[PDB]
Every structure is written in structure tokens, then in C-alpha cells.
A paper describes a structure:
(a) The dltE gene encodes for a 397 residues protein composed of a transmembrane segment predicted between residues 12 and 34 and a larger C-terminal extracellular region from residues 34–397 and named DltEextra. DltE is structurally homologous to the D-Ala-D-Ala carboxypeptidase R61 (DDCP) from Streptomyces that exhibits the classical β-lactamase fold of PBPs.
The positions of the active site S-X-X-K motif (128SIQK131), containing the catalytic Ser128 and Lys131 residues, and the catalytic Tyr213 from the second motif are conserved. The position of the catalytic Tyr213 from the second motif is also conserved and found in the loop connecting α5 and α6, close to the catalytic dyad. In contrast, several striking features distinguish DltE from DDCP and more generally from PBPs and DD-carboxypeptidases. The global architecture of the active site cavity of DltE is therefore reshaped and different from that of DDCP enzymes, adopting a deeper cleft topology largely opened on both sides of the protein. The catalytic Ser, colored in red, is buried at the bottom of the catalytic cavity in DDCP and lying in the middle of a large cleft in DltE.
Author numbering: 72 to 393
The structure:
């Protein structure tokens, strides 16, 4: 029952010290939709169901889909070497687009620019400053620069910005009204990130988390977007239902590797897909069934390592799936 569901999920969230918005869908029907704690404590603004949160690394699933759309259009191939798009790279030149999508490259960018740069200069800074580790080639190892460099390929091949691509193929395509780029401001129902102590569980809101324009620009392709929980579910479900990309091409994209569950910008699990993001005081979590009909989205503006939301979403999803 929805009464049962409401009591059980609210208890799980309360015991885990949840701050943010929670959405639970079963067989295409919303069965739980509630918010907890504060979007901004100093202004006495409560989080709401349609509050906007950082999707963080979950954005990489969307960058991946963009690449695979270009594959279907005949404009790139997953076998392409990175040097085809970045001809001044010194090392790792043989690395394929497939490996970039699967976090099986030896690339790592230690830091982005401290300056606020436009997209083309963010891309150039990465290509000039990335390190290459031959012993990490072909083995799962999480490295965000892979997806920033994928965002640069979208820009190069299309002749338009990544923001323009994202706006066209996600925001406009799916009529998203609670989604955008953090650099331009969140608008109504904005949230503020909070900084926690290592062992903190109870929220206290005594320290806000800054993010610079530089930090937001440097998350090109990788964690620069805000969404409501509804908008995030709409996107991920639309992917798996084959509304953005044929189901044949989703199947190609979303394939695990020999060394990891990660493939095509998501974790390919035993019972659907998972994506997790952390950064800037925020945490994001989605678990979704393979057919896109049943899942859980939690997003928080008050990340606490001692009260992580992914574990909570995992518990909810496991119960949901039986």
C-alpha cells in the first residue's frame, strides 16, 4: 500500500539522517515523493519535492548517450583513437572512445584551471595537462577527465557547445523544466550545499560549501548540471526505454568490461543500472530497473560520509524489486 510505503520509506530516510529529495517509482507509477531538511538554512527555506540538486557524476551517463547518438549518425566510431580528435596529445594516443566511456584508460587530470575558462579553453587545458599511466590502460579505474574529453569530442564534431548539445537533446527533447547549468543559476527552488565533519550524522548547517565559477566550468561533461529528482528519473528512464537512442544502441553502450561493472557511463549491475555522484557538499544516487519502469532517486545538498545516501537508495531499491 502507499500508506505502508510512506511509513516504511520515511522511517528509512529519518534513521539515515536524510536531507534532500526522495523519489520512488514502481511500474511507471510514483509511489513516494517527499523532501526533508533545508535547501538554505539561513534563509529558512525547506527542501521541496521539486528543489534542484547537483546531478554530479550522473551527468556522465548523459555525455555517453550523446557520444552514442553521434555513432548512430555516422559521425564518430567507438573504435576511434583519442588522437583523431586531440592531435597534440603526447601519450595514450591509441586510447579508444569505447575505453573512455568505460573508465578503462590511463588518463588522469590532477587539477583543472584555477581561472574561469570558456568551454573551448577548458578542453584545451585538459588535453595539455592530462597525465597518462600505461599500467592503467585497459583496467577499470574511475577518472573524470575521460568524460570531459568526450564532451570535447561532442563539441568538435557538432561545431556547437556542449551546453547547446545538452539543451537540445535532453532539456528540449524531454521538456525538462527543472534542469540546467549551475553556472547560469538555479532559479526557483534552488539549493545550497553544506559542508560536513568526518563523523557527522545529525545535520547542523553550520558551514556552507563554496563552489567557484572555475569549479563549475571545469565540470564540463561531468558534473555541471542541476535537476529535480523528477527530471533525473525522466532522463534515465527515457534512456533505458529507448526514447533517446535505439534500444539496440543502448545495449551496445551499456556493456560492462572484463574488469568492471562500469560501461557506457553507468554501472551495469545484476538488477539494473546504478549511478552515483559526490561533490561540492552534494550527493546523488539513482538505481533503476533494466526496463526503466522501477527505481529510486535520492539527491542531497548535505553530503555526510557517515550518513551516505547511496546505501539508503540501495536498501529501498532491493525491497522495491521484490
Amino acid at each position: 500500500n502507499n500508506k505502508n510505503t510512506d511509513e516504511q520509506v520515511t522511517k528509512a530516510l529519518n534513521l539515515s539522517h536524510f536531507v534532500g529529495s526522495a523519489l520512488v517509482v514502481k511500474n511507471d507509477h510514483v509511489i513516494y515523493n517527499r523532501a526533508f531538511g533545508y535547501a538554505n538554512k539561513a534563509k529558512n527555506q525547506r527542501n521541496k519535492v521539486n528543489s534542484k540538486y547537483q546531478i554530479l557524476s550522473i551527468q556522465k551517463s548523459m555525455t555517453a548517450v550523446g557520444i552514442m547518438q553521434l555513432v548512430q549518425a555516422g559521425k564518430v566510431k567507438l573504435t576511434d583513437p583519442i588522437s583523431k580528435y586531440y592531435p597534440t596529445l603526447k601519450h595514450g594516443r591509441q586510447t579508444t572512445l569505447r575505453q573512455m566511456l568505460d573508465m578503462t584508460t590511463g588518463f588522469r587530470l590532477k587539477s583543472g584551471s584555477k581561472e574561469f575558462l570558456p568551454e573551448n579553453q577548458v578542453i584545451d587545458f585538459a588535453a595539455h595537462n592530462v597525465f597518462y599511466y600505461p599500467d592503467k590502460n585497459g583496467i577499470y579505474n574511475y577518472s573524470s577527465v575521460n568524460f570531459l574529453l568526450l564532451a570535447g569530442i561532442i563539441r568538435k564534431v557538432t561545431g556547437q557547445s556542449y551546453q547547446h548539445f545538452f539543451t537540445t537533446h535532453f532539456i528540449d527533447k524531454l521538456n525538462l523544466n527543472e534542469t540546467g547549468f549551475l553556472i547560469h543559476g538555479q532559479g526557483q527552488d534552488a539549493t545550497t550545499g553544506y559542508r560536513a565533519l568526518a563523523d557527522q550524522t545529525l545535520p547542523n548547517y553550520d558551514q556552507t560549501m563554496p563552489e567557484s565559477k572555475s569549479q563549475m566550468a571545469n565540470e564540463l561533461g561531468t558534473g555541471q548540471v542541476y535537476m529535480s529528482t523528477a527530471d533525473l528519473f525522466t532522463v534515465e528512464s527515457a534512456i533505458l526505454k529507448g526514447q533517446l537512442l535505439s534500444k539496440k544502441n543502448v545495449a551496445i553502450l551499456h556493456t560492462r568490461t572484463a574488469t568492471g561493472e562500469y560501461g557506457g557511463g553507468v554501472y551495469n549491475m545484476s538488477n539494473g543500472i546504478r549511478s552515483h555522484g559526490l561533490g561540492y557538499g552534494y550527493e546523488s544516487s539513482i538505481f533503476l530497473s533494466p526496463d526503466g519502469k522501477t527505481g529510486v532517486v535520492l539527491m542531497s545538498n548535505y553530503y555526510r560520509k557517515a550518513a551516505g545516501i547511496q546505501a539508503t537508495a540501495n536498501k529501498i531499491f532491493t525491497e522495491l524489486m521484490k
